[PDB]
Amino acid sequence: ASASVLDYLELADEHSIVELKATEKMAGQSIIDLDIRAQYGINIIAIKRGKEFIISPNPNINLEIGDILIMIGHDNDLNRFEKNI
Amino acid sequence: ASASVLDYLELADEHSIVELKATEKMAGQSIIDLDIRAQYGINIIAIKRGKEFIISPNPNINLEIGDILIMIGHDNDLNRFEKNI
Ligand SMILES: Nc1ncnc2c1ncn2[C@@H]1O[C@@H]2COP(=O)(O)O[C@H]3[C@@H](O)[C@H](n4cnc5c(N)ncnc54)O[C@@H]3COP(=O)(O)O[C@H]2[C@H]1O
């Protein structure tokens, strides 16, 4: 629980973790609908909805407009996902 | 806002990031064999291989001995997965 935190900090400092806002194209759909990791190689860590923090989001729930997705992956993969929306 | 993830976990008393070392029971299996998120609601952010981090792990690779799964989810879900191993 203390080594677990330090590995996260080390991991956040060698791979980039990014905030990304949900577009209209993507609202109404779930992250299993978009099939993100199979399509981009990206992992979605959490969702900020309004002032609520959804950790380990259920992949079957509907994404709303303005949802801020917290992502981890290579910049080459994050950039493609950001452009495809 | 990679700390926003870490900040939530510190104040949250029911959610937590936990490391779990792969056992022979679990080695030889993939995380899609175990179907971890679909079965427990747990998200695996990365795998520690040696002292290196495999981010957004490919769910089809076999887990090797000594692999450290870095997991994030509800304490009851994490605890249930751990007890089944
Ligand atoms: N890092 C991980 N941690 C825990 N379990 C993992 C995992 N990678 C794979 N799995 C497990 O393997 C199943 C299929 O993974 P896949 O990545 O190919 O295909 C996934 C993926 O493309 C997408 N997805 C789901 N949750 C995601 C997320 N947090 N980030 C990105 N994509 C996700 O929806 C598909 C099916 O998701 P589902 O949860 O139903 O089922 C997942 C999940 O049970």
Using CB atoms within 10 A of its CB, is residue B4 exposed (0-12), middle (13-18) or buried (19+)? middle
B15·A55 Cβ contact <8 A: yes
Which residues neighbour A74 within 8 Å (Cβ) at sequence distance 6 or greater? A15, A41, B55
Resolution reached, in Å? 2.7
Give me A78's structure tokens.
């994050």
Task: Check B74 against A59: CB less than 8 A apart.
Answer: no
What number of C-beta contacts closer than 8 Å exist between A and B? Answer: 81
CA separation, residue A48 to residues B21, B25, B72, B77, B78 (Å): 30, 36, 16, 21, 22
From ligand 1's centre to the CA of B3, what distance in Å?
23
Question: Which residue ranges form the domains of chain B, and what is each CATH number?
Answer: 1-85 (3.30.70.1450)
